[PDB]
């Protein structure tokens, strides 16, 4: 035991990183996204936020059983001291990473190039996003590299609201001839922000006065 506070919090962050990697590698065909550690007394609560939990889970509870074991044996927990859980994510349409691996799996399933992104854009927008972007930067069919911007709606690109509102995802899709880059951008409608700032700092709304009937010489009422 017995650690620096400094050393620890960093150490935790690396733990996160490795953990998120391993799942991102392991649960692609299940639409993996994110983790959250939730440490407790007596337990450690890894929560897998994929889309197709039935696959994450496995026959009356296998695979997550395998995956636990895995995560377990490596980082050296003590059977029971760590626990796993599948959690289908509220609308995949607003997770960059969700729609990245979508298009990976679009192109990779022999799909037109624009049909991929123009689909992904359409679904993402239709899912209630306020803005979306798809770069495809790479090499297809012909020898030279190209790129392609696919976008619709509204995005902002600078300063803090970026951190707050736009999700970014790059993914390397390894095809026959070379690889290409998928790059996904979703901008979430700041209106619905829930926890956080609920607009653009840009936003300056005026409250709308009132028609008033003036006149009427004095007079007072009693009570």
Partner 1 sequence: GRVRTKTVKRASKALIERYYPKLTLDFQTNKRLCDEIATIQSKRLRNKIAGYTTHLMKRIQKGPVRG
Partner 2 sequence: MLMPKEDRNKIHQYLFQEGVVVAKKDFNQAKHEEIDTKNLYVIKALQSLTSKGYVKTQFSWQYYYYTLTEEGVEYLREYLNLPEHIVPATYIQERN
Partner 3 sequence: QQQQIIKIRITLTSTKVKQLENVSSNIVKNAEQHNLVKKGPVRLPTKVLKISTRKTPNGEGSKTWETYEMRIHKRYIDLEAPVQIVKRITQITIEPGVDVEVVVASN
Going from the C-alpha of 28 to that of each of 7, 33, 92, 148, the distances in angstroms are 32, 9, 14, 24
The verdict on 161 binding RNA (CB under 7 A) reads yes
Q: Between 45 and 74, how does the x/- string for binding to RNA read (CB under 7 A)?
A: ------------------------------
What is the rounded distance in angstroms from the CA atom of residue 139 to the CA atom of residue 90?
A: 34
Cβ atoms < 10 Å from Cβ of 114: 13
Q: Which does 170 bind (CB under 5 to 8 A by kind): RNA, partner 1, partner 2, none?
A: RNA
The verdict on 221 binding RNA (CB under 7 A) reads no
Q: Between 75 and 94, how does the x/- string for binding to partner 2 read (CB under 8 A)?
A: -x---x--------------
Instruction: For RNA, give the closer residue by CB, 67 or 165.
Output: 165
Stretch of 12-20, 85-93, 107-115, 143-151 lying at the interface with RNA (CB under 7 A): 143-151
Question: DSSP state, 202?
Answer: T
DSSP assignments along 127-157, one per residue: TT-S-EEEE--B--SSSS-B---EEES----
Site for partner 2 in 105-134 (CB under 8 A): none
Identified binder of partner 2 from the candidate list 8, 13, 16, 18, rule CB under 8 A: 18
The verdict on 149 binding RNA (CB under 7 A) reads yes
Q: Name the minimum Å distance from CB 202 to partner 1.
A: 7
Instruction: For RNA, give the closer residue by CB, 62 or 157.
Output: 157
Instruction: For partner 1, give the closer residue by CB, 149 or 198.
Output: 198
Strand partners of residue 169: 184
Pair 64, 57: CB distance under 8 Å: yes
Closest CA to 165 of 102, 106, 94: 94
- Tell me which residues touch partner 3 (CB under 8 A): 5-6, 8-10, 13, 36-41
What is the rounded distance in angstroms from the CA atom of residue 58 to the CA atom of residue 55?
A: 6
Instruction: For partner 3, give the closer residue by CB, 6 or 25.
Output: 6
């Amino acid at each position: 035991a017995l650690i620096s506070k400094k050393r620890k919090l960093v150490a935790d962050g690396v733990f996160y990183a490795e953990l998120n990697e391993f799942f991102t590698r392991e649960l692609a065909e299940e639409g993996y996204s994110g983790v959250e550690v939730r440490v407790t007394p007596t337990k450690t609560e890894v929560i897998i936020r994929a889309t197709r939990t039935q696959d994450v889970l496995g026959e009356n509870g296998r695979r997550i059983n395998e995956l636990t074991l895995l995560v377990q044996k490596r980082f050296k927990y003590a059977p029971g001291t760590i626990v796993l859980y599948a959690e289908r994510v509220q609308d995949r349409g607003l997770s960059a990473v969700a729609q990245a691996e979508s298009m990976k799996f679009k192109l990779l399933n022999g799909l037109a190039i624009r049909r991929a992104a123009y689909g992904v854009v359409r679904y993402v927008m239709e899912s209630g996003a306020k803005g979306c972007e798809v770069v495809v930067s790479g090499k297809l069919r012909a020898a030279r590299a190209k790129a392609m911007k696919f976008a619709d709606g509204f995005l902002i690109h600078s300063g803090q609201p970026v951190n707050d509102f736009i999700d970014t995802a790059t993914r390397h899709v390894l095809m026959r001839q070379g690889v290409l880059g998928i790059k996904v951008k979703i901008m979430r409608d700041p209106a619905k922000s829930r926890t956080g700032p609920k607009a653009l700092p840009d936003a300056v709304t005026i409250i709308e006065p009132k028609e008033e009937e003036p006149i009427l010489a004095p007079s007072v009422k009693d009570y």
